[PDB]
């Protein structure tokens, strides 16, 4: 016959090798692929969808869980008071775990791209005021007050004019390698910071609730990317 020399690797079964194998049913014509609505092709499609960010990820009591979904603002907050705060950490625990984006991030090891958090004022329509939502880039420390936050990337939101406002988080990268406990994890360190202050107090006329809630939705821009699949989960199929 024809001359050969088997090279090392012969007979190995690589869980990742993606060659072809013999068909079990050679004659079988599998029922045709028809048209189904909403076909997903690449997962990054889903990363660009907005999902509620549980910023108020504090109540854990079983029937208050519907509250992590929206934080509130009220008349009782003096001008300059810190309303809320969280980091630009899609992967790591906390608020981002509720967002779909965060959830996908868990099947990947590295990633980077611009994020986008949109806020929604769902209070009475008769309410007005202003909020100062500031972003303190990675490394920068949470501004001491509303004034110092007013000197860095910020946005005065008059929920009196527009019911919605969207903020773009320029960049976040989870690529710096950490070999802490004994388990080497690829962590941020790029914990950007989003602070929210009462620029003015909550002004509402008589007859309107003195407390409104705000919902914060999040998604990743189109410049987003992920690398290295890493199947991981606390919820697996039970016996």
């Amino acid at each position: 016959g024809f001359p050969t020399e088997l090279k090392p690797g012969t007979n190995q079964f690589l869980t990742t090798d993606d060659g072809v194998s013999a068909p079990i049913l050679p004659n079988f014509h599998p029922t045709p692929c028809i048209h189904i609505p909403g076909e997903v092709r690449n997962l990054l499609e889903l990363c660009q969808v907005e999902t509620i960010l549980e910023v108020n990820n504090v109540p854990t009591n079983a029937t208050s869980l519907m509250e992590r979904l929206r934080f509130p603002v009220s008349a009782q907050a003096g001008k300059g008071e810190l309303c809320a705060v969280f980091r630009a950490d899609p992967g790591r625990n906390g608020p981002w775990q509720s967002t779909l984006l965060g959830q996908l991030c868990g099947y990947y090891t590295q990633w980077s791209g611009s994020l986008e958090v949109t806020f929604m004022f769902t209070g009475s329509f008769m309410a007005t005021g202003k909020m100062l939502i500031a972003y303190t880039p990675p490394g920068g420390p949470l501004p001491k007050d509303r004034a110092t936050a007013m000197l860095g990337t910020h946005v005065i939101w008059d929920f009196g004019l527009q019911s919605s406002v969207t903020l773009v988080i320029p960049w976040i990268s989870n690529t710096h390698y950490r070999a802490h406990a004994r388990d080497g994890v690829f962590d941020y360190y790029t914990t950007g910071l989003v602070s929210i202050w009462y620029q003015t107090n909550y002004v509402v006329p008589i007859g309107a609730p003195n407390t409104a809630y705000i919902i914060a939705l999040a998604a990743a821009q189109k410049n987003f990317t992920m690398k290295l699949c890493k199947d991981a989960s606390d919820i697996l199929q039970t016996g």
Partner: protein
């Protein structure tokens, strides 16, 4: 403002907010070269495709959320509930319209979305050791709908904080009252039993609780008017 009419059904609505066409596809029909070219599937135009306005559910501070199953919500009602039962196969689309009638002094937010194959998983006995299958009143709640008990997991062990991944639209009281959606027929098959299978389910949950000072009407009449689009049937009985 301006009123629209489809037959004997005349609803009064706003000019044209932003409609949501689920998955960008329009409820179209099914062409001649399908699996049943013998039993021509008759496409109900006359009264079958008109406005059905359901028993307005009342919003409260304590409301958890509501959900209806499709086509279950109508297989009971009218001349479409006539075809849905005494017909063997079905394929349809839906112009769903949800409205709130509340003053500029009530506040709230409703997330309105459509979820295909919405399979209700019950609580399972509590501790988790009872394989209880949801009743038939929870699986197909008619046109009265049904109240979620665990809105956070959508009574199916899934975070609602992610439901926006389905066709949805918001009903913030301080910005809008009406919310509209167009649903295309969706299933792994071109046709299917209109009684044994609820292709999807309409979910409308209060994400920002309804509130108001004392004196203002304590309830917000949520009116759900909906109508079939390019709906098709086949095989009378």
């Amino acid at each position: 403002v301006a009123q629209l009419t489809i037959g004997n059904s005349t609803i009064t609505t706003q000019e044209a907010a932003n409609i949501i066409v689920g998955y960008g596809e329009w409820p179209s029909y099914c062409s001649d070269s399908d699996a049943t070219a013998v039993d021509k599937p008759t496409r109900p135009d006359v009264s079958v495709n008109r406005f059905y306005t359901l028993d307005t559910k009342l919003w409260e501070k304590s409301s958890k959320g509501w959900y209806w199953k499709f086509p279950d919500v109508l297989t009971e009602t009218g001349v479409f509930g006539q075809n849905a039962q005494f017909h063997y196969l079905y394929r349809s689309g839906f112009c769903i319209h949800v409205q709130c009638n509340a003053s500029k002094f009530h506040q709230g937010a409703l997330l309105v979305a459509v979820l295909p194959e919405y399979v209700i998983g019950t609580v399972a006995g509590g501790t988790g050791t009872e394989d209880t299958h949801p009743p038939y009143k929870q699986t197909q709640p008619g046109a009265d709908g049904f109240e979620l008990q665990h809105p956070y997991v959508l009574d199916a062990g899934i975070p609602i904080s992610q439901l926006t991944v389905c066709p949805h639209q918001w009903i913030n009281l301080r910005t809008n009252n009406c919310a509209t959606i167009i649903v295309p027929y969706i299933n792994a098959l071109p046709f299917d039993s209109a009684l044994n299978h609820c292709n999807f389910g309409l979910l409308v949950v209060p994400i920002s609780p309804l509130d108001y000072d004392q004196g203002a009407t304590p309830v917000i009449p949520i009116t759900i008017t909906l109508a079939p689009m390019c709906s098709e049937f086949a095989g009378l009985r």
